[PDB]
Symmetry: C3
Subunit: 145 residues, 3 copies
Amino acid sequence: DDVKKAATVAIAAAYNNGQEINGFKAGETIYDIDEDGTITKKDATAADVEADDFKGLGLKKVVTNLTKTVNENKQNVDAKVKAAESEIEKLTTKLADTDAALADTDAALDATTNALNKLGENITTFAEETKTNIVKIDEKLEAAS
Amino acid sequence: DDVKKAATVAIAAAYNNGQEINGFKAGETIYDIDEDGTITKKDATAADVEADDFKGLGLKKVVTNLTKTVNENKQNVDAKVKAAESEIEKLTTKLADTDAALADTDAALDATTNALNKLGENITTFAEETKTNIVKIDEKLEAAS
Amino acid sequence: DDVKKAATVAIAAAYNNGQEINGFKAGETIYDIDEDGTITKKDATAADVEADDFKGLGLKKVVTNLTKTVNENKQNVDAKVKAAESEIEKLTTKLADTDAALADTDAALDATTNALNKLGENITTFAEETKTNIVKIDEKLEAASKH
Ligand SMILES: [Cl-]
């Protein structure tokens, strides 16, 4: 009967879909359904398993593992980014301390430059007044002879 | 008949696979198939739902949500990395401005050091010529008794 | 018979589940099962395909592609983070070189300030000893005048 065959194909088809969802291993019974509706009862070899889309894991196991990978990869990158941001924060505070110390260096350099200029002007005046006094003395001596 | 039984198992199995793909909720009819091929018509409890791999969501809904998570996690990290890189770009420009200001400080310090050395050489000569002149006058006075 | 119908529904249901796992395309036979258990043999249109959850790809193909996306996105971000960290490492070494050069500038500025102060102290003494000497000579001349 054609109803006997249809029930047989349906069992085999439901069985195979179940293995796609829940997986299979070497030795486990697998059914191959022909275009002619001919059902072949085989046993999954190491080849069938190794060269399967998910290597006999099944859709449920793969999706569960993928969910684990997605979350693990997010935790891992979130912590790498938090590390880099902390390094950036420490470089910012150090660069701010460097700029502050340079501003102090400039203020000290400017006070040193100004003191040098004042000393130079004070020496120039003193040298001019000394020259004038020595010249006056020489003239009093050059006259007294 | 064994064909009656086979059709019944096939319906129950196809129903069960459909729930794995499309999901189930508390109250919804669930079928438990025995190794003996005995089909039990139960009703999904809150336990069956809460302690299910995807909590009755089904493979389609989970994979759809996972695709949403993957893309959302990529947008989120891409923007955190773009933020960190902008902070790095601003630290680079500021450090380059700091090094430039320090190079100017060094040039100004070298000019101050050089002017200080020249001034020191200039007073040494003046001080030497003053000593010579005072000593000559002292001799002119010591002679004139 | 009710067993004839049950076998027919089961075939159609198993066929549909298979399409959800392995996918479909426009033209491919699709079965629509009624609540009444009435099976309708249709042909997937461009609408059925375009407005499907995974657009007829099937669960296997979507999960395989998603695995590719997850790994590609991890490789891509791992390299962007490795790039940023290398930039951070180079900024650290340059900032350390800047701080070292500033410490040298300060030491040189401190030596210049100290040499300026000593010079100012030496000129003051010389200037004081010169006034004393000119003043003594001026007195030796002023006395030698009052005769
Ligand atoms: Cl099925």
